[PDB]
Amino acid sequence: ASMKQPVVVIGSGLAGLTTSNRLISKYRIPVVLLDKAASIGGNSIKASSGINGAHTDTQQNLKVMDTPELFLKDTLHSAKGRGVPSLMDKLTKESKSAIRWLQTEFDLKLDLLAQLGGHSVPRTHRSSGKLPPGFEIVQALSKKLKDISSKDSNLVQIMLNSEVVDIELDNQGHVTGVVYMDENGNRKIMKSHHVVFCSGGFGYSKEMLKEYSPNLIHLPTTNGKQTTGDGQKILSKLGAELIDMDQVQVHPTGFIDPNDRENNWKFLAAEALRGLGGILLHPTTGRRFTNELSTRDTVTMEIQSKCPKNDNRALLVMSDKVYENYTNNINFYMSKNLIKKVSINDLIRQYDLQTTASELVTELKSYSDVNTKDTFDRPLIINAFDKDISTESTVYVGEVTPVVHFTMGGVKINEKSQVIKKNSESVLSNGIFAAGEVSGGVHGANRLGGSSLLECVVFGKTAADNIAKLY
Numbered sequence: 001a002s003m004k005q006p007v008v009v010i011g012s013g014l015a016g017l018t019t020s021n022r023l024i025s026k027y028r029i030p031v032v033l034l035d036k037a038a039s040i041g042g043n044s045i046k047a048s049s050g051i052n053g054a055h056t057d058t059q060q061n062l063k064v065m066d067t068p069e070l071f072l073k074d075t076l077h078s079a080k081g082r083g084v085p086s087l088m089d090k091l092t093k094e095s096k097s098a099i100r101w102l103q104t105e106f107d108l109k110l111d112l113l114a115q116l117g118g119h120s121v122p123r124t125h126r127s128s129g130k131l132p133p134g135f136e137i138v139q140a141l142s143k144k145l146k147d148i149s150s151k152d153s154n155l156v157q158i159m160l161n162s163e164v165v166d167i168e169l170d171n172q173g174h175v176t177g178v179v180y181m182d183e184n185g186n187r188k189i190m191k192s193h194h195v196v197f198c199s200g201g202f203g204y205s206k207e208m209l210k211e212y213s214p215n216l217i218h219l220p221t222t223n224g225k226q227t228t229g230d231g232q233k234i235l236s237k238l239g240a241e242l243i244d245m246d247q248v249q250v251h252p253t254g255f256i257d258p259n260d261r262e263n264n265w266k267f268l269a270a271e272a273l274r275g276l277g278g279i280l281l282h283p284t285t286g287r288r289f290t291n292e293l294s295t296r297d298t299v300t301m302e303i304q305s306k307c308p309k310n311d312n313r314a315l316l317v318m319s320d321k322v323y324e325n326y327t328n329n330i331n332f333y334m335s336k337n338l339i340k341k342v343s344i345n346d347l348i349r350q351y352d353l354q355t356t357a358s359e360l361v362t363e364l365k366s367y368s369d370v371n372t373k374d375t376f377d378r379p380l381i382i383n384a385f386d387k388d389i390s391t392e393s394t395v396y397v398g399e400v401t402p403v404v405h406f407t408m409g410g411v412k413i414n415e416k417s418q419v420i421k422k423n424s425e426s427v428l429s430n431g432i433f434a435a436g437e438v439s440g441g442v443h444g445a446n447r448l449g450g451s452s453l454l455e456c457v458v459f460g461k462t463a464a465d466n467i468a469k470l471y
């Protein structure tokens with residue numbers, strides 16, 4: 001393309017980093033990436049379980065059979081009649097290409113799998129090594145932009161500490177600029193004809209929770225303090241449709257920090273910890289109480305009903321075999337006192353359980369016996385406990401509690417990642433796009449683990465491809 005005014009990308013999470021990379025590298029369209037925070041990455045850079053793909057090279061290598069049709073089936077089942085089915089079709093159909101894009105353009109291995117809740121087969125990809133998938137992916141995409149910037153400053157600029165506050169439109173009805181507050185709190189306008197909102201969810205915002213899901217306002221969150229629904233609000237005021245805003249995902253397993261127990265913010269206990277073999281024990285009885293691998297709305301409901309009203313937490317207990325397949329991650333959690341390695345005898349006392357050690361042993365064994373029926377219907381039992389586990393055998397334990405995690409609602413988009421006008425199927429503006437958690441309609445009533453990083457890549461690429469047709 002001939003260089004004109006920049007495309008403004010709002011937010012440097014995976015949706016924004018995807019959109020920017022695709023614009024600059026495929027089309028040589030100039031980008032200005034604005035983020036109101038002090039650093040790149042949003043909640044994306046903190047993501048720990050991985051990114052979904054159906055029918056990938058990694059699945060083939062590991063002899064997992066998966067299709068876009070099965071992924072779509074799991075996604076429609078998760079959605080429970082909410083959202084836009086054709087966007088779920090797109091999300092799942094283009095996921096093979098998403099994983100391939102990360103592997104071929106950025107040499108991300110993505111060679112390991114985990115099966116998360118609501119998934120029929122393992123399709124959540126992560127790379128072997130020390131780096132969790134959120135950080136590995138953000139790091140690689142940001143490094144590419146920074147390299148490109150250093151060679152051609154006009155092709156991409158990243159501007160941090162820049163909070164977008166509005167979009168300016170001409171008489172009817174085109175984008176002419178982006179209004180933002182710079183590092184010094186001064187109003188600035190970035191002149192532009194194309195803007196992509198990649199500004200994330202609203203899960204941290206107590207006021208938006210009061211408006212859309214009032215019964216969640218006292219729950220802790222995994223979200224960073226930047227997660228305040230800015231783009232949703234800005235776009236709704238400009239006349240965009242919002243959809244499914246009252247669909248807020250509460251993740252069942254945020255870690256409790258033993259030295260800061262009532263912190264409103266929690267580290268997340270990656271769902272892979274359960275997918276790869278971890279179980280949940282009741283915090284008083286020391287006994288399993290539910291299917292740990294169902295969808296997040298269902299596991300959370302079980303914890304909130306079966307664990308004590310006051311003191312609503314559970315014990316996440318992981319075997320040596322879980323540790324061997326998730327070593328670096330668990331080592332990290334241990335470094336933050338979030339997981340402790342303990343003998344079964346000490347587990348009983350350190351967590352004030354009613355069960356005897358010998359009784360807990362009997363339980364772990366029958367859970368691990370996969371020739372014995374599972375009390376709670378768990379669809380996948382791998383890396384369970386040693387058959388001759390004794391009271392002095394060690395396990396890994398963390399304390400977990402439900403947390404506000406993800407907002408499925410947001411601005412309505414179409415298949416081109418264009419923002420849809422309120423009460424209409426026409427676009428609000430030829431130059432307004434959105435991608436990632438700021439958008440609504442992709443997940444419906446519940447998001448499958450692994451599909452939010454996926455959404456970022458699929459719809460970020462889409463926004464870039466479609467701006468390229470118009471630029």
Ligand SMILES: Cc1cc2nc3c(=O)[nH]c(=O)nc-3n(C[C@H](O)[C@H](O)[C@H](O)COP(=O)(O)OP(=O)(O)OC[C@H]3O[C@@H](n4cnc5c(N)ncnc54)[C@H](O)[C@@H]3O)c2cc1C
Pocket residue numbers: 010011012013014015016034035036037040041042043044045046047048049050051052134162163164165198199200201222223224226228230231267268405435436437438449450451452453454456
């Ligand atoms: C602990 C945690 C763990 C997670 N683990 C996984 C996982 O394992 N697998 C998976 O698929 N997903 C996971 N997710 C969700 C996922 O990682 C992303 O958060 C999600 O995909 C949204 O990405 P995003 O690009 O839309 O938004 P974000 O990554 O949140 O980035 C949005 C950016 O927009 C900036 N911004 C916000 N408002 C403005 C404004 N007015 N002006 C300018 N900039 C603004 C923000 O500062 C932020 O940097 C996890 C999320 C969290 C919090």
Ligand SMILES: Cc1cc2nc3c(=O)[nH]c(=O)nc-3n(C[C@H](O)[C@H](O)[C@H](O)COP(=O)(O)O)c2cc1C
Pocket residue numbers: 046048130131132266267268269328329330332333
């Ligand atoms: C396995 C693993 C899981 C992590 N989980 C979270 C998390 O849930 N929430 C979060 O904010 N950061 C998470 N992080 C990020 C760390 O808090 C930290 O930002 C990162 O390790 C960078 O190290 P630093 O503190 O020296 O900057 C995780 C990191 C790893 C390696």
